[PDB]
Ligand binder design. Sequence first.
Ligand SMILES: O=C(O)c1[nH]c(=O)[nH]c(=O)c1F
Length: 228
Amino acid sequence: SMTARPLSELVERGWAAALEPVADQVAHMGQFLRAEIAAGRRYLPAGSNVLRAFTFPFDNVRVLIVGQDPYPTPGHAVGLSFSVAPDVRPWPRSLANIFDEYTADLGYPLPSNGDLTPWAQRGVLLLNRVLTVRPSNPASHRGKGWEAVTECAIRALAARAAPLVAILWGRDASTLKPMLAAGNCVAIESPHPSPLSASRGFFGSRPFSRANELLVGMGAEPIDWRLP
Ligand SMILES: O=C(O)c1[nH]c(=O)[nH]c(=O)c1F
């Protein structure tokens, strides 16, 4: 796990270099998670999926989606924010809300399933501000040291000689707003797609079409958002 091995082995080459300043903090998080198991508390997602968002190429990222923390229901979280395994049904409520906005915004049919890896394969970073959670306890790992790691990840993206659009979903995601001051970066901010906050302005936010207009405006290729 991230206790055992260096970034060079755990994440993609560009990410390994981008996250060098938090190499120790990443090892520290591995120890936090080992202490959780030792005490008999569980975490999500599975250890090998915690850093999965950093296994897609750093240099290929054009859009950053940031949520709060992983799905608290066992069998949901896969290390990509809001993504579920292609065989998961029903979809978690957040994802149902995201796909309703996806159809409203882009005019596409409902996706066949909740598997977002096409977005990750097409330059969308599916990040959470905090990369682990205790089952059934949303925000249970807030302030345990992931924030430094996702802050570093964002600074590094914003320092690239490349265009970037950030979609920040909810209050924890929005605390990355200051580290997105770079001129080649633009932030879309909305309430979380979670049922508690969705009606406060998630619905009708049109994040997907706006992201693409912003990319086009910076001479970047738009994202192909269409899922099968
Ligand atoms: O629990 C959720 O709905 C949820 N919320 C988030 O902010 N990110 C996720 O990756 C996620 F699965």
